[PDB]
Amino acid sequence: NAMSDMKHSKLLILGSGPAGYTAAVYAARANLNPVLITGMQQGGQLTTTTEVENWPGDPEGLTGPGLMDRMKEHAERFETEIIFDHINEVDFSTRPFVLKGDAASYSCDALIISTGASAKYLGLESEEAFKGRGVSACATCDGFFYRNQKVAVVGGGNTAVEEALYLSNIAAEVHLIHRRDSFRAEKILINRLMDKVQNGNIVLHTDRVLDEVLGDEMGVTGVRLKDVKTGGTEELDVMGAFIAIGHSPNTQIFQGQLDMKDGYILVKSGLEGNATQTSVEGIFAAGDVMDHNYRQAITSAGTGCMAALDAERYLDSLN
Amino acid sequence: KHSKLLILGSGPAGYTAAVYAARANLNPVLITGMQQGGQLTTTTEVENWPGDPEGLTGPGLMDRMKEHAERFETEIIFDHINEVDFSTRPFVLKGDAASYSCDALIISTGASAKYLGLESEEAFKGRGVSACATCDGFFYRNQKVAVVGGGNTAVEEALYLSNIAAEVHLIHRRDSFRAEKILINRLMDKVQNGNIVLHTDRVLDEVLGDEMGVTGVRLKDVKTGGTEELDVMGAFIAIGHSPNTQIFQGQLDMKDGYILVKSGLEGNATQTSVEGIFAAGDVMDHNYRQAITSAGTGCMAALDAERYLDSLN
Numbered sequence: 001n002a003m004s005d006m007k008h009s010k011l012l013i014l015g016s017g018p019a020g021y022t023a024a025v026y027a028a029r030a031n032l033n034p035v036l037i038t039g040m041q042q043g044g045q046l047t048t049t050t051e052v053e054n055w056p057g058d059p060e061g062l063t064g065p066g067l068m069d070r071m072k073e074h075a076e077r078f079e080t081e082i083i084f085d086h087i088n089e090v091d092f093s094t095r096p097f098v099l100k101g102d103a104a105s106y107s108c109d110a111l112i113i114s115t116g117a118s119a120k121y122l123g124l125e126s127e128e129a130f131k132g133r134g135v136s137a138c139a140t141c142d143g144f145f146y147r148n149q150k151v152a153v154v155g156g157g158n159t160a161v162e163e164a165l166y167l168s169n170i171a172a173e174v175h176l177i178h179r180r181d182s183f184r185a186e187k188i189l190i191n192r193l194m195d196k197v198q199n200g201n202i203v204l205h206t207d208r209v210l211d212e213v214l215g216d217e218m219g220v221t222g223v224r225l226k227d228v229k230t231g232g233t234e235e236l237d238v239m240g241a242f243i244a245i246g247h248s249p250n251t252q253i254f255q256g257q258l259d260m261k262d263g264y265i266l267v268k269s270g271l272e273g274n275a276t277q278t279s280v281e282g283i284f285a286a287g288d289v290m291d292h293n294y295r296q297a298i299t300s301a302g303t304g305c306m307a308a309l310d311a312e313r314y315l316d317s318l319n
Numbered sequence: 320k321h322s323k324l325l326i327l328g329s330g331p332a333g334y335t336a337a338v339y340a341a342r343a344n345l346n347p348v349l350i351t352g353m354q355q356g357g358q359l360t361t362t363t364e365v366e367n368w369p370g371d372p373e374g375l376t377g378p379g380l381m382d383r384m385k386e387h388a389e390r391f392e393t394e395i396i397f398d399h400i401n402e403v404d405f406s407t408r409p410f411v412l413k414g415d416a417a418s419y420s421c422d423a424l425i426i427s428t429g430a431s432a433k434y435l436g437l438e439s440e441e442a443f444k445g446r447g448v449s450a451c452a453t454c455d456g457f458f459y460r461n462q463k464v465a466v467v468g469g470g471n472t473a474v475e476e477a478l479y480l481s482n483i484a485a486e487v488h489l490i491h492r493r494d495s496f497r498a499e500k501i502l503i504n505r506l507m508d509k510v511q512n513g514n515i516v517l518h519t520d521r522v523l524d525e526v527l528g529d530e531m532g533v534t535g536v537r538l539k540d541v542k543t544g545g546t547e548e549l550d551v552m553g554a555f556i557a558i559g560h561s562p563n564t565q566i567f568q569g570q571l572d573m574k575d576g577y578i579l580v581k582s583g584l585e586g587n588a589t590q591t592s593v594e595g596i597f598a599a600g601d602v603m604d605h606n607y608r609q610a611i612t613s614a615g616t617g618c619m620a621a622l623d624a625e626r627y628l629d630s631l632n
């Protein structure tokens with residue numbers, strides 16, 4: 001443990017997802033000697049999915065972990081300095097910028113924020129009570145515990161549908177709960193889903209919200225659903241409940257210091273360059289932390305590249 | 320031939336759009352244009368496509384993108400659009416022999432090499448003036464050649480030619496280059512220890528040659544106006560690219576040839592000034608112009624179009 005013998009670098013990148021690692025590749029080739037803080041989820045959100053089929057140019061068989069191992073190797077090839085830490089506090093009122101991690105503090109002249117997003121929970125007291133004892137937000141992490149069991153999935157987007165598909169090969173049955181009667185997942189995934197609904201072991205509970213997670217002193221034994229149209233409730237017996245209701249941008253540490261809207265970092269955007277510039281000159285943002293609309297790996301990688309070229313131009317304008 | 324979605328262009332923006340459109344069950348039809356695979360098919364080394372191991376080549380990446388689009392059953396058509404009508408719905412586009420219509424359109428027709436516009440430069444095209452080093456470089460085996468330009472393309476072309484030609488004369492109107500720093504390091508190693516010669520603070524004043532082709536160039540000093548002559552067998556022009564938008568003039572809002580799009584943080588960012596027409600890649604980006612950013616906006620254009628098509632019912 002050190003006393004603010006701060007590590008200074010010209011360019012600091014927060015995050016080890018596709019935006020952060022693409023930013024590193026471009027910044028290293030620009031001779032910026034980037035330093036990248038991985039955060040607690042090394043490799044980012046893709047490391048919890050098993051198949052990526054829309055990373056353009058890859059043959060059948062890519063996995064999430066596989067792509068992000070390649071991305072780390074690529075940043076390392078250009079001598080990116082990669083540090084396993086997690087930033088818990090920042091000071092952007094001062095130059096150089098100061099970021100406090102759990103291991104050390106860091107300072108920089110330019111900062112790329114690509115801290116991505118974390119799984120959202122419903123915010124129920126019973127959901128919180130059963131976390132780790134049958135409530136989970138990560139099906140690849142916890143699915144194998146439910147072999148031949150009944151499990152629930154809550155949500156109606158790409159993550160929920162993918163998690164229900166993944167669990168259907170492990171669990172005896174998957175109860176997919178969603179508050180409307182149609183899904184916003186990719187159509188190819190909806191086709192796979194509906195094939196398992198009519199021929200397989202997925203059961204739909206549309207127009208439902210999770211009212212309460214039910215359980216004993218050991219863990220989950222069911223969920224109560226509420227009909228969104230009538231207010232009536234029913235019970236479903238399951239041993240596990242996977243929460244797949246979206247991801248929230250990881251921006252809590254920047255509150256009050258960057259312009260933000262609904263937790264997303266605002267950037268210049270536009271067609272005239274400097275499109276990833278935040279409200280603080282010299283701080284740029286890339287990936288899911290500033291995109292509430294597209295939220296793909298390829299679009300995250302693309303804005304990661306833009307943040308590195310923006311930062312390079314900004315640092316060049318200093319000297 | 321009608322389709323819900325037509326994509327113009329077989330570069331990384333077009334093919335990423337096709338992958339996403341195909342997975343959205345839109346049955347995309349993609350027109351390749353004349354340069355099948357796009358600009359990247361003319362570079363030998365791609366080192367900043369994130370996640371690829373050492374040794375990726377342009378044609379190799381673009382072969383992979385095409386297979387990816389084919390896997391999801393994109394319909395890929397070798398044709399080139401010479402005329403469009405956007406005042407009608409569905410939109411109508413005319414290729415070399417057949418006509419196409421669509422309810423939604425993604426334009427990702429990229430950019431093509433600019434020439435200086437000199438009379439002698441025009442006169443010697445195909446006879447020693449070229450804008451593509453990997454297409455023509457083999458013809459100058461152990462010869463002296465010139466490259467004009469100061470960006471990533473000119474520096475990469477001078478480096479590529481330096482393994483083929485005896486001497487490469489790199490001509491640029493300032494004394495520093497705007498290429499990636501790692502490429503400038505490689506260039507300066509071959510300047511000090513190899514067969515590349517810098518002619519900084521120079522512009523190409525005239526291409527010289529005989530009845531068969533180029534035999535020299537006249538350079539002009541940008542500070543004094545004095546001139547000198549260089550003996551070369553070939554001149555490669557690498558002064559940037561210009562967006563392939565001529566066929567859209569008068570039907571989409573444009574600025575300097577770039578198609579304008581909504582942009583912004585609220586979605587529909589690739590929407591042009593015509594509802595149901597979207598643009599992605601180098602046709603709408605004059606600032607970043609990389610394969611990875613083109614792929615990203617091709618993804619956005621496919622998701623914008625899917626929402627548009629859904630809204631029709």
Ligand SMILES: Cc1cc2nc3c(=O)[nH]c(=O)nc-3n(C[C@H](O)[C@H](O)[C@H](O)COP(=O)(O)OP(=O)(O)OC[C@H]3O[C@@H](n4cnc5c(N)ncnc54)[C@H](O)[C@@H]3O)c2cc1C
Binds near residue numbers: 038053
């Ligand atoms: C289950 C699942 C499946 C998916 N499948 C696909 C798919 O098939 N195709 C696709 O295109 N997209 C997919 N996505 C989306 C894709 O994962 C994201 O769009 C992409 O990962 C976003 O990249 P990013 O770099 O912005 O953020 P992330 O990948 O979220 O990475 C953010 C990084 O920031 C770091 N970080 C966070 N907070 C801090 C802090 N305080 N200090 C330092 N570092 C921090 C994290 O540790 C992480 O490394 C999927 C997502 C999920 C959850």
Ligand SMILES: Cc1cc2nc3c(=O)[nH]c(=O)nc-3n(C[C@H](O)[C@H](O)[C@H](O)COP(=O)(O)OP(=O)(O)OC[C@H]3O[C@@H](n4cnc5c(N)ncnc54)[C@H](O)[C@@H]3O)c2cc1C
Binds near residue numbers: 609
């Ligand atoms: C020599 C060179 C080296 C490069 N190296 C790199 C690199 O290492 N890394 C990197 O990231 N980027 C590199 N780039 C840039 C990269 O090539 C572009 O950013 C990217 O190709 C743009 O993709 P795109 O799909 O927008 O356009 P393009 O790849 O240009 O594709 C446009 C497509 O549209 C088609 N088209 C044109 N007109 C019509 C029409 N009327 N009808 C139908 N179709 C039409 C064309 O046939 C072509 O298929 C390089 C470029 C060059 C020239």
Ligand SMILES: NC(=O)c1ccc[n+]([C@@H]2O[C@H](COP(=O)([O-])OP(=O)(O)OC[C@H]3O[C@@H](n4cnc5c(N)ncnc54)[C@H](OP(=O)(O)O)[C@@H]3O)[C@@H](O)[C@H]2O)c1
Binds near residue numbers: 122158160
């Ligand atoms: N294969 C892939 O490309 C892939 C895989 C995973 C993720 N992604 C991308 O990553 C992003 C995140 O995906 P996601 O599915 O995690 O999020 P998402 O697209 O935001 O979906 C959230 C789903 O949960 C529902 N929901 C949200 N809050 C809720 C609440 N409090 N109670 C009940 N239901 C709630 C939403 O319902 P409504 O529909 O009623 O709002 C929606 O169906 C998306 O852009 C996605 O496309 C892509």
Ligand SMILES: NC(=O)c1ccc[n+]([C@@H]2O[C@H](COP(=O)([O-])OP(=O)(O)OC[C@H]3O[C@@H](n4cnc5c(N)ncnc54)[C@H](OP(=O)(O)O)[C@@H]3O)[C@@H](O)[C@H]2O)c1
Binds near residue numbers: 468470473497558
């Ligand atoms: N490795 C890669 O990532 C890679 C490889 C190739 C291309 N690209 C990208 O694709 C885009 C296109 O690059 P590019 O190099 O083709 O074009 P560019 O970036 O526009 O550079 C054009 C170069 O030519 C010079 N120039 C322009 N017009 C001129 C004229 N009339 N006479 C003399 N000189 C002239 C410019 O000089 P000034 O500098 O004096 O303006 C500049 O040096 C770029 O954004 C580039 O980074 C990337």
Ligand SMILES: C[As](C)(=O)[O-]
Binds near residue numbers: 259269277279
């Ligand atoms: C709206 As702003 C100050 O983040 O460019």
Ligand SMILES: C[As](C)(=O)[O-]
Binds near residue numbers: 581590592593
């Ligand atoms: C920039 As516009 C007129 O296409 O919204």
Ligand SMILES: [K+]
Binds near residue numbers: 049050051
């Ligand atoms: K996935």
Ligand SMILES: [K+]
Binds near residue numbers: 362363364365366475
């Ligand atoms: K290249």
